[PDB]
């Protein structure tokens, strides 16, 4: 869509966090959520997990009413919406100094 544009000093390895996105349907939320992760699509690896699936029924069974869920670095970052503010926060500091 857009190659994007945003360069700044960093001086650090290259590796973004894996955001576990759990969408479902019918759910006009998981829809918007994503849209909320548009400016953050490159901010990390948006892992869209289909909870509507049987093999993933577990994810759903655990998060059938607490979606959409968002796990940053394999840790529930936020659910029931997409509080960018929260996301961004984590984004800034997640991995940390030498870790992984």
Swiss-Prot record:
Keyword hit for Transport: yes
Domain of life: Eukaryota
Residues of the full protein shown: 21 to 107 of 115
Protein name, entry field: Glutaredoxin-like protein C5orf63 homolog
Disulfides per UniProt: 27-30
Keyword annotations from UniProtKB, A to Z: Disulfide bond, Electron transport, Transport
GO cellular component: a single term: mitochondrion
Family: Belongs to the glutaredoxin family. YDR286C subfamily.
Organismal lineage: Eukaryota, Metazoa, Chordata, Craniata, Vertebrata
């Amino acid at each position: 869509g857009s190659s994007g544009s945003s360069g700044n000093l960093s001086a650090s390895n290259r590796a973004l966090p894996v955001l576990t996105l759990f969408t479902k349907a019918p759910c006009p939320l998981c829809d918007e959520a994503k849209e909320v992760l548009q400016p953050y699509k490159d901010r990390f690896i948006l892992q869209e997990v289909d909870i509507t699936l049987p093999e993933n029924s577990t994810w759903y069974e655990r998060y059938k009413f607490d979606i959409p869920v968002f796990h940053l670095n394999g840790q529930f970052l936020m659910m029931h919406r997409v509080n960018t503010s929260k996301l961004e926060k984590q984004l800034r500091k997640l991995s940390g100094p030498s870790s992984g």
